[PDB]
Design an enzyme around this catalytic site. Sequence first.
Site, short mmCIF file in Angstrom:
data_model
loop_
_atom_site.label_atom_id
_atom_site.label_comp_id
_atom_site.label_asym_id
_atom_site.label_seq_id
_atom_site.Cartn_x
_atom_site.Cartn_y
_atom_site.Cartn_z
N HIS A 63 -8.91 45.71 -30.80
CA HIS A 63 -7.39 45.48 -30.40
C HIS A 63 -6.53 45.98 -30.91
O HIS A 63 -5.45 46.34 -30.53
CB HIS A 63 -7.46 44.11 -29.27
CG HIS A 63 -7.82 43.00 -29.76
ND1 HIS A 63 -7.01 41.98 -30.66
CD2 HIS A 63 -9.30 42.64 -29.69
CE1 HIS A 63 -8.06 41.11 -30.74
NE2 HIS A 63 -9.32 41.43 -30.25
N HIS A 93 -0.03 42.03 -37.44
CA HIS A 93 -0.60 43.24 -36.73
C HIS A 93 0.34 43.86 -35.90
O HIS A 93 1.64 43.45 -35.97
CB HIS A 93 -1.80 42.76 -35.73
CG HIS A 93 -1.09 41.98 -34.60
ND1 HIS A 93 -1.11 40.52 -34.73
CD2 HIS A 93 -0.57 42.04 -33.45
CE1 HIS A 93 -0.56 39.84 -33.57
NE2 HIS A 93 -0.31 40.85 -32.87
N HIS A 95 1.33 46.48 -32.40
CA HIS A 95 1.32 47.06 -31.02
C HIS A 95 1.56 48.63 -31.00
O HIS A 95 2.92 48.45 -31.38
CB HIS A 95 1.53 46.33 -29.86
CG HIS A 95 1.12 44.93 -30.00
ND1 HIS A 95 -0.09 44.50 -29.11
CD2 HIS A 95 1.36 43.89 -30.65
CE1 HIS A 95 -0.48 43.30 -29.34
NE2 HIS A 95 0.67 42.85 -30.54
N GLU A 105 6.08 45.97 -27.22
CA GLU A 105 5.84 44.88 -25.89
C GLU A 105 6.89 43.98 -25.55
O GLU A 105 7.34 44.25 -24.31
CB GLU A 105 4.63 43.54 -26.67
CG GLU A 105 3.54 44.12 -27.27
CD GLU A 105 2.44 43.10 -27.17
OE1 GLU A 105 2.64 42.14 -27.65
OE2 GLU A 105 1.28 43.45 -26.43
N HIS A 118 4.08 42.14 -35.26
CA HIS A 118 4.00 40.58 -35.31
C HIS A 118 3.50 40.20 -36.24
O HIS A 118 2.23 40.28 -36.75
CB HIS A 118 3.08 40.51 -33.99
CG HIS A 118 3.61 41.00 -32.79
ND1 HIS A 118 2.56 40.78 -31.56
CD2 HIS A 118 4.77 41.06 -32.26
CE1 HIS A 118 3.65 41.24 -30.47
NE2 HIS A 118 4.85 41.45 -30.93
N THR A 197 0.43 37.38 -26.58
CA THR A 197 0.62 38.66 -25.72
C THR A 197 -0.85 39.22 -25.56
O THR A 197 -0.97 40.05 -24.75
CB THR A 197 1.40 39.59 -26.31
OG1 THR A 197 0.90 40.24 -27.37
CG2 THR A 197 2.78 39.30 -26.59
ZN ZN Z 1 1.01 40.82 -31.16
#
Ligand code: ZN
Length: 259
Positions: A63, A93, A95, A105, A118, A197
């Site tokens: 992911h 990590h 996104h 996000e 994050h 999230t």
């Molecule tokens: Zn995250």
Amino acid sequence: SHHWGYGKHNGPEHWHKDFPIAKGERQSPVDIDTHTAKYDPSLKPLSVSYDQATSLRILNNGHAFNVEFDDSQDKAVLKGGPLDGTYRLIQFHFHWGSLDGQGSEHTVDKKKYAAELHLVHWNTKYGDFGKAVQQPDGLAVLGIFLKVGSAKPGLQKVVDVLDSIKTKGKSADFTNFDPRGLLPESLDYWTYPGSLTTPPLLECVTWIVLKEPISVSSEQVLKFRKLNFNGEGEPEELMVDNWRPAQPLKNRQIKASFK
Ligand SMILES: [Zn+2]
Ligand SMILES: [Hg+2]
């Protein structure tokens, strides 16, 4: 969600069937309407103390990729601001998008950044991460936006190890990485109560989203986009657009640390 992901058949619109909290009262991310956010003089100074952070490993979980930290001692901690007590860094990590115009996000007056970092911390009062995610104040996530422009020198060591973790399930040693090199100059932030999230979407998080983005180069984010959601020897599905869109704010106020 038959496993959850970011595709048409398993993405954010499907998560609620396995994770009904997806439709909960304090889901993340949200849009940060800067005009509606209010300065909060009750916030204390924010303290990001990463000097003794001990990274261990970098992992492609299918992911995103996580840079993991040794959280067995009181080392890399977040305190102050809206937080009561001490929160220990466990992993970070990102996104990101398929294109520079999307990927974050959180949004800021509906603006999407190219990516979002994050830094995930757990409240030491609860002993470990797993107990912390049974608590309404178990986690604090420090979110930092990424825009494309100048390179972030402190990000390059991450970028350069991504070729070793291309596919789901691959990890690599990743010691001695200093997350201070990922921070912007200013700690001005917005904060609100929210959730993870990704599944399991647990409503445990005090979000602290920095106002100042970091800049990363096009070349750096292009290397993020070469990662794979799939495992080795499986059909390639590039790891891009691994972001959840903004969720309903419901009965929340976003507070600002700054005037
Ligand atoms: Zn995250
Ligand atoms: Hg979890």
